[PDB]
Symmetry: D3
Subunit: 133 residues, 6 copies
C-alpha cells in the first residue's frame, strides 16, 4: 500500500546499532523493496535530502554529520508504512522520544539520532527519487 524512505545514519554504524534498528522495523513485518549502502554519501545528496533545512543554523553541522560515516538507504513497504515507521522512529527531541521507540530507547542527541524516516506521502516520493533515482 505505501512506500517510505529510511536512512540508517552514521551514528548507528559508530555505535554498532545498525542491526538493532533494522531489526525493530523487520519484526514489525515491513518488507524491504530497495536498499543501498553508502560508504560516504555525496554532500549534495545530503543537501537535497535536507533541502527544507538549508536556512537552519544546524544545516552545515547536520550535513557534516551525515557524511561522517556510512549510511544505508532503504525503501520499506507496508500498509500505512510512512506513519507507522515514523511512530517506531520516535520524536526528534530526546526530551520527548518515548521509551519503546528507536530514538526513545537508543538516541540521546537531537542531531545524532540514528534514523531518518519520510514524514509524508509527498516527501516519501521525493526522498525515494533522491536515493534511488
Amino acid at each position: 500500500l505505501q512506500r517510505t524512505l529510511v536512512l540508517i545514519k552514521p551514528d548507528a554504524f559508530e555505535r554498532s546499532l545498525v542491526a538493532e534498528i533494522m531489526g525493530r522495523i523487520e519484526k514489525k513485518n515491513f518488507k524491504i523493496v530497495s536498499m543501498k549502502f553508502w560508504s560516504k554519501a555525496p554532500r549534495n545528496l545530503i543537501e537535497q535530502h535536507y533541502k527544507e533545512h538549508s536556512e537552519q543554523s544546524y544545516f552545515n553541522d547536520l550535513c557534516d554529520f551525515m557524511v561522517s560515516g556510512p549510511i544505508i538507504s532503504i525503501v520499506y513497504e507496508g500498509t500505512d508504512a510512512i506513519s507507522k515507521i515514523r511512530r517506531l522512529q520516535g520524536n526528534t527531541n530526546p526530551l520527548a522520544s518515548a521509551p519503546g521507540t528507536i530514538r526513545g530507547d537508543l538516541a540521546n542527541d537531537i542531531g545524532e539520532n540514528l534514523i531518518h524516516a519520510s514524514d509524508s506521502e509527498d516527501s516519501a516520493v521525493d526522498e525515494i527519487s533522491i536515493w534511488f533515482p
Copy 2:
C-alpha cells in the same frame, strides 16, 4: 487478585513469535494458572469467544483466521492482571498501537494481531469458562 484470559493467535505460530509474546508477559511477573495448546480450535469455540462480534462484517474472516493454525489459551494471575495485560497487548489498530507494546512492536494488521486478552472482569470470567470449562 485477578485472573485474565490470553490467546496466542495463529499468526504468532506462523511468524515464530510465541515465546516473544509469552516472554513479555512472563518478565512482567504474571503467573500462569492454566494453559492449553489447541492444534486447531473448534470453530464454535471461536464463535463463542467472539460472540459480541457476530454482526460485524469481519466476523467470518476472523473465525477463519482463528482456526487457520494453533492457539494457546492461558489464564494469567496477578494484581490488576486484566488491565495490565491489556496495556502490554496494545491497541487493536496498527495506526494506534504504541511501540513498547506487543502489538505496537510486532503486529502490522488490525486482524492478524498476535494476541487476545480479556478486557474486563466480566469478560475474563466468560472467556475463562469458554476455554477452560
Copy 3:
C-alpha cells in the same frame, strides 16, 4: 521427521526463563504439536518418567524437585528433532555444558537444570505416552 518430548522444569518458572527456553527451540524452527501445563505434576508421572533413576541416590530429591513447582510438557516436531534438541539442551553436568546451549548459558546445577529432552526415538515414544496418553 521426529517427535520429541520436552519438559520445562520448575526452576524455569522460579527464575522466569520459560519463554527464554521455549524461544531457543522455536527459533530453531521446531513446531509444537502438543503441550500441557501442570500446576503440580502428579508424583507417579514423575517417577514413571525417571524410572531408570529409581534406585539412584538422588531419585527422591529429583522427584521432590520435579513436583516443587509447575512444569510444561511439550511434544516438538522436526527433522531429527530428538538429537537436535538434545544438542541445544546441553550436558547435565554444569562443568561440561557448552556456552551457547540452554544449560550452558542458563543452568548452574546438576539437578536444577531447567529442561528435559528425550534422548532417543524409544524414550521419546515412552515419554510421549506418559505425558500424552
Copy 4:
C-alpha cells in the same frame, strides 16, 4: 551537563534483572561516573534517601524492603540525564507505567519497582551526597 542518582533495588537482584536495567540506561548512551555495590545498605542511609516519605504509612515496609538484599548506587551523566532517566524508569504505579519503560516492562508492584532515579536537580545533588559523600 547533568548528573543523576540511580539505585538498582533488591528486587532486581532477586529476579536477576540487574543487567537488564543497567543495559537499558547504557544503550541510551548515558555514562557511569560513579558506582557502588551495597551488600546491605545501612537503614539510616535508606531513611535519609527516603526522608520525604517518613510520615507515609509505607515508610517502614519500604525501608525493610530496601535493606532486604543488595543495592547498586550509580551516578549517571548526560545532557538532561535527570528527566531522561525518569522517563526510562516509568511511573511508580503499575497501573500507569508505560510498556517500553523499565517499570512498564518489568515491574508489577508499586513498592517492589526495581529502580530509583532522582526526580530533580535539587534532589540529585542531595542523593549523590548521601550515597557518595
Copy 5:
C-alpha cells in the same frame, strides 16, 4: 585485515531473521564495506557463485532456492574476517552445527541454512568480484 563475502539467503527474509544474522556479525565488531540488496538475484550470478556444485544432485534445487526470495550480498572487513565469520556461521549439516553459531541456533535444514560466507582468501576474491564487479 581481510574482506569476506556474506550472503543473507532467502529463508532469512521468509523467517524475518535478517537483522538477527547481521546483528551477530556486527556485534563481533566486523565492518560493512559494501552491500547490495537483490529483490531476486539473477540466476547466472547464483550459478557462478555455486559453480563448484554445478554437477551435484542438489544444484538445481539450490539455485531454485537462492532465487526464491530476496538476498543481501555483504562484504565484511576485519582481522581474519574470513575464518572468524565461517566459525560464527557454523556447519552446513544441522546435525553438526554447534549451539552458539548462526546455523546452530537458527537453521534446521542442510539447504535452507540462512547464510553464506566465503571459505578462503581465494574464494572471497572470486565471490566479491561476482557480487561487486
Copy 6:
C-alpha cells in the same frame, strides 16, 4: 562454593557492552558479592594484576589499554564459579574462542577482549586481595 574476580575491561565501556557481559554471568545464576567502579584504574593495581606478564612484549600496551578507560572489578560467587566463568569467557585468541562464549560472540582482538576472569583458586585469592584489600 567459590569466589572469582572478574574485570569488565575498557573496550566494554567503549562499545557499550558492560550490561551485555554482566548479563551473561547473571543469567548463569552467579551472585555479585563485591563490586567497584574505577573511572581509571591506578597503574600499580594493573601491573600487580598482570604481574606474570611483566616481561612480555605486550605488557606496556596491555597496561596502557587497561588504564585507557573505566573498568569494573566484580567478585562473583557460585559453585565452581572459577572454572564456569572461565568457560563463559572463552579463549584469549579470537581464532579459538567459541561462538556462545563472551569473547567468541563479542571480541575480535587478542588484547581488547572485554573481560578478565580468575583462572584458578589461587589466582582468585590474589586478584580479590588486589582489587578488594
